[model samples]
Target: CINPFTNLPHTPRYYDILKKRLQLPVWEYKDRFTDILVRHQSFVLVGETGSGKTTQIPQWCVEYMRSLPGPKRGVACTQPRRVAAMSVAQRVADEMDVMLGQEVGYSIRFEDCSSAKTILKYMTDGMLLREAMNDPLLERYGVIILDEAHERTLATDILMGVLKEVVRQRSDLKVIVMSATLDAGKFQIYFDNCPLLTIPGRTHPVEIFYTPEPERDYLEAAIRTVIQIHMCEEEEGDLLLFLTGQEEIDEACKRIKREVDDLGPEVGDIKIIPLYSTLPPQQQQRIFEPPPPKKQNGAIGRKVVVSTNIAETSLTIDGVVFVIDPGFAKQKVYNPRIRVESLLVTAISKASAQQRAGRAGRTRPGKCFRLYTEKAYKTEMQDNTYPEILRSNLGSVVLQLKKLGIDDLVHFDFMDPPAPETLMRALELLNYLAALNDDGDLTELGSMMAEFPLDPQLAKMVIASCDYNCSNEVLSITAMLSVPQCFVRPTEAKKAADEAKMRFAHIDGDHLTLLNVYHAFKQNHESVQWCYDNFINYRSLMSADNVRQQLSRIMDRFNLPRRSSDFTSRDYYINIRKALVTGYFMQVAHLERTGHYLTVKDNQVVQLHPSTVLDHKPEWVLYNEFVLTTKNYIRTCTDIKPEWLVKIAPQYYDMSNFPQCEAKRQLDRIIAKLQSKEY
Candidate 1:
């Protein structure tokens, strides 16, 4: 073989690494990859699970960038999540025979381990979007490959639009898009007929089993499938059953054990582990334990894992050779008008079903028991689930795009555009917050507002807080607002936890209740045991502190003042509540003559969440969110004076477009009383 650029020295494992690299299906296409890479600057590549596309494609681009005769330029591979990039970067470095962070490193929010020497960089998709704020063209990267495009993250979707224009603007740039499924052809079409390269997965054959017919009460159906696999197959393979959440998972495990122990000594003892995102670390790690050392105990004794989709990707257990896919998983869907966001249990898509099936056979031949008819698979399932961007609010994405200097948002190219009503709603809200001006242009304040790594409403609250003389308290409040589920209510001791929570409760609302918790948490010296005694989530509170420190630095960079009302004065809480009003005035609701809360203008019926701290129902209230999980509920609310709304946000409270409600009559008098001033 002819040698090129042999001056660099590598370790003794270089040859061994090269052999392993060749074993990857992606490695065989190395020469063709660079050939097509150089021939066309824009292209798409699709590979299946274990195709090594995530690691190898970026490494190939790094070497391709090296062969170019120019100044050292970096190549970045963007991932859907942060920890994935961090872990994947370390392995890529190991494969390249270099120490991590020297030439290969990862960057994520609040943590950047990379430097100028970085040639191959891995980062969360949104982190790159943040990097685009200052470098609009993304000129720092030469060859940009966005992996897991199928995840359809908000950042991934927005970057596709940004890069579409960027590649046209920069001739030196090369763009490669990669995903794990052929549904990724949608990306190819969006990229205007970019050449596609496919790689065979380094995987074994997987046989699929479908239920005889449609089955209601899928948990019962799912449980029976696992028993039949053990009774009929008699193989040593471990099992992975996909359920929705910890609730369903826990219930499934209990019944599975009941039946497994009923079979007693004839069938193997099944070991079940419940997997959740917040599951205890020790329990999360237990999936890696092998299926217990005995085909002798009950011949072909093996463990069965009935878990949530937490086992979906990146948590592959090599021994899982048979899987029970119930064809159901929870997916997030949001409503901007109601401000609702939830992951409701729903049918899994074809791409997702394939992904869950691929988890099996990572190390051996496998079978997947799908709990649905082939008819259901073909008729009901979509090719892919809706991307997250389509499901959530567009406020922050619009702000970032404005900060990235895009003036023509309506005309922006998206792979799939969101609803027009939702787009207009995002624009209207940002305009009310003064992030975008009357003429629909990004304002100076808006650009500063975009610098925050938070929602526009909360960011606006933080930016507007000092004027109310409560920056000190509002910062802590916003930090708490950022992290959800700040309090714990264990089922075993619910009433005790409620009383403990009430000890910190302020009569105004849940927001101040949270402020009281933070103050007491600090007053208690930030002790974890103290939090346990108080029924607070210690980790979430600590994360709020971390968020506070990070956001405090951004305020410092902007030179936002840090003033506060005197602690002894009544104005301390009053001023903090006013600070919240300035940002969330758009989220206000009012009690009608019927004595139930209705959101302003929209008139959506909303009741205070059961968790609220307001001792008496107030006529006017501002909320942090209007959720529709199971009912119309206002969450994280604070009572406010009607005059404060008129004085602080007259534009939003304008009498012209006011909806006819009992509160509007009172607002009429307030408007008349306020405008009866000079003029």
Candidate 2:
């Protein structure tokens, strides 16, 4: 006998597992879904989480596309995040009974697991966008699946617009936009009213409970609720509590451990696990580990996993029978006026609340405890998150669009256009950096800058570092900044961690301190244990290592010299500082008479964060970014001599074109002092 779908014979074992997995709701509508794909040029699918939409839909397409009697075709599925792409790809590979990379594979930044024999490919949206740059037609792929389209990430949004035009030009190309939300209508209209398909999820029912009044301190309230559920609730299952950030989640973990210690052993064992993106992958895998063996009394320990928003969508943890939603997550908010972008802990939207609740019901009957009142969920919460494009600074995105041959950004089709001021601000910055010409076209340097994944400022600095003879150091620093922070301060050893970190601190500043740490890590014989003793994030350091290698390849690609200043030379620091200004001329700040530092361009008052090693104030500083928290603070800063700005960027730092202020006056005095001393 032959399988009707595949038109091929299969073992009983294959059919058994396939039938078991097909118990998922998506399998019920597989034929209809594929039938619509056959009839229409494009389609939209709204399948909730646990609907098996991500893993199974791609498999169905692979088999169906393979069965077609025409030339072999490829299906490219794009995920919003890299982890999603890799995880989903592995899952599909298992279902297909094929080698992971041969027939099913994934491509992400700095990593590609696919091979030439690959017919179904899973990749991050950014990776696919990069491919589109070289092959604008994307002739290699016959079907493109934009999974999780409702997230509306910057890359997803741009791809949606690009494919809208691509589909019109190439009728042979088919696009299926799959979302987990009810925004199918929006995608439908965005794609010229594409046909819609909805797949229900096969998961246990979740009963949601809301607080009568809003809790002032949600963290403390969340702790209390978790304890109550553990002590009083009779039904036993794992608990998933959603928090906002690493700091908050770690604090909550400690608090829970301390409070649970007082609950006594008779209450049963409670395992506390924390999940966040920055956590080492090994540590993150612990969340999937089952709770400890049942005690002598046949009672299982409760596993309470506290996590950030990355868990909400990027990952799925089964056996979550209880979910504690504080109704808040840290979201990026950008002030286009001051050009400041910061993350603030804010209330989650209605869609987010629903997503959190759905997590509990994946395995069995579950319960969701909401910290906010039902009234708030109804009237106060937004229907969906504001797309990332609206809130993010468009500097990197604008450069990418131009590199993709998007000349008229204003006329480009955006599902939701950014603020006019936001777009104009991005254009002005790009032009100032010489990435764009007077007519807002991509320059040769702009095209080069787009090739690297770094921000425009960092890319420019790297490109200019060749002339400064510090490209190697700048490349290392750039890679370090791209990954997670290297310093690690566990709650119990915060004081010791601070002291350990200070050993690598350079008098110059945090940037030099980072370089010092990297060099030390390389010089050490026992690197892993060395990092452990120093409280360094070993995984992040390794990640930076990978980034450095990748960026080095790109540097070599452009014929840029990977040279470093001699360690014994007095000019080492100077060369590094000059390279800093080359990339960060626009981010320069000068010390004000009042003792605070003010940005040269925007005049925004910012002070060096206390984390910096530069205790003595420098006349000028080049900072990586302004982090808004307790104060307006300049983070990852390096001291720079005022003369370096003019010497490195004469056009940008010409005092004659500047307004009379402390920064300009200082620059003028420094230039004169250097010239007179030379005479």
Candidate 3:
């Protein structure tokens, strides 16, 4: 497959096919890609969505770079989300008429789809940043494209700042920032007025409407709203309803389908599909095609796409005439001090609201039904979303800046820099993790961990696994544990679901359960059936496997421990505890008369998550406990360990109110006896 205009073979055939499918001039794309190499080799290519931006431009860049005098390597495009990165790369490869993992592939936090011949790879922005930290020039890639600049994720912002300097330092590296619905003018300001190119988007007129009331029970409201719209419009286009998360999307879809069923099979035909990050790949994509007509006629009819923010950009949902927007999105905000990640539901910026509206008009004239009132929209909406730098924890960014030898983060030119409090918390965490000395220099292990592609906590977990002589076990569990394990679907038969999951529980914690589940699945060829039999969400398991795969690749790149079997307790736990020492210092809690913990730092009462295997090990819990979600649910910690409390939550080390050694010794003995009998 060659770029017809340039007489040069396109990057790996798959990507080339995608480019050609978009019907863009190959010669023009190459010229645009090459310009970054000439003036500012490390530059950004910002393109609108639906402009064949992801597929077409990367193909041109990879091909053009391969023809140069140096290495014939292709390009790596970093996306904000793993689902988008992998899906886009695979689609491009498919268009090129090549195997999925051959020429064009993708890698995410836990997954990779590359083989020996892969040239163009797609990965998350964070993943690429980790790579850049090690090889500031991005030596393995000739060109790097950061897609979706409009999202302005913290990772993207930091990467841009890092690249701005790297471009000045490395003359050979080429950077491209691609996005649709981005304010190029603002970006121009960020990039020092870099060259700009506009490729027109294919859009049809979409009538916009505003709801009278603010969204309440957003999920349920979306359901009722979609039904009302369908009843009134009675048009023949698939509906794309935007919600905040999988829970909302899934619940809406379920209700939408049930309502259609109640209308009785003889009335009419309607298909409802759930589209979100957590759904299985095939099911998530069901909305892309028309639904099967009322079973009798066996003809295509209108459909509905209940989705999360993923549909707002990167994807073109065919035949979507109506869009239902809750005008909200879920964001992960990390607290560097505690190294805890919390999900917050926040308002979508005006830019995002416009993006959602645009989804309806992608293929034809459509309509957008916003769920917020005009008053709320006018008064409550932010002019633009806060820059990632300001909203997110700056631990990693601070580490990178330090590695780059920049001392004053406050003085740095970030669109929205971090709050002083956030920065201070990160500094505290750095000292605890031993990543920074009292004087703020990188420790030997911190530098090494930075070299590896892992979140700080995970890096610590892997290192600690070695110390437990559970390196292999820890690696296996930590990998699974690293990703969210909310795979088990809550079912009507709570007993069955509990039993299926309990079997996999190691009495250690969620980490061990993840390890058990993955080992079981891997032994089964990573089959989805294993997940189904266990009443787990097959899609989540697959996603987890993808996450594991990506982590494994990063580990290999750094020459870190690859397999669980190679772990030594001393090498693993020593490093792991050191990692934990950084983030979990403030997580310590003290036991009170009420049998719950009162953490000294915040004085917040906390309990171990009910799901922990050691929940019941009252005597062994010592000072620290798994932080419970709420006070409503009381559960036992099935797996209790003395060190987990002692090392990770050392603040519990108050010896003043000591139970005499004899009293504690008796408690430990009793707990050990119970644990031995699977208490």
- In terms of lDDT, which candidate is strongest? 2
Count the clashes in each prediction: 0, 0, 40
Model 1, range 1-679, lDDT digits (tens) per residue? 3212334676677667777767877877888888899899799888776667877888878878888889669998998765467767777777777667778888876557687678888988888998898898888989898888877888999999999999888989998888777673388888889898888775677898898888889888778888788778855788899998766776777666666778556666667777654443334557767676664656677788877765665445668889899988777777877655556778988888888888777878889899889989898888778777778878888889888888887799988888877777788889989999977789988999998877898988999998999998899999898764777876557789888989988988888898899899889988999998888988778878877888899889999997788989999889998889889997888987787898887788889988787888888899987666567888888999989988888789888988787779999988888669766
In lDDT terms, how accurate is model 2?
Answer: 0.83
Off by over 4 Å in 3: 1-47, 182-185, 200-202, 278-287, 293-300, 334-340, 400-413, 504-509, 512-533, 537-585, 595-597, 607-679
lDDT of each: 0.81, 0.83, 0.64
> Once all C-alphas are superposed, what RMSD does model 3 give against the true structure?
6.6
> Candidate 2 on 536-579: residue-level lDDT in tens?
88888888888899999988888888998788998888888888
Instruction: Report the lDDT of model 1 for residue 502.
Output: 92
Order of all candidates by TM-score, from best down to worst?
Answer: 2, 1, 3
Cα RMSD to the true fold for all candidates: 4.1, 3.1, 6.6
How many clashes show up in model 1?
Answer: 0
lDDT of 3 by residue, 1-679 (tens): 4644235665575464555575642335666556655666544455545667776778777667767897667688878876678677767776655566787888764455787778889888888777776677777887778888878887788778777777777767777777775572266557776766666666677787887777667777777767666666644677788777776566566566667667655544667776666554445556556565645643335687777788888676667778888888777666555444456677887777888888788767888888788777778887677666666767677776676666777777776567788988777666656677778787776675565455554565565444444545545544555554545645346778777878777543444466667778878886767777887766666666666665566556655664433334444433433333333444444455677654434455567655554534343332223332335222222233444444454433333433444333443554466458753
What is the Cα-based TM-score of model 2? 0.92
- TM-score-wise, the better of 2 and 3 is 2
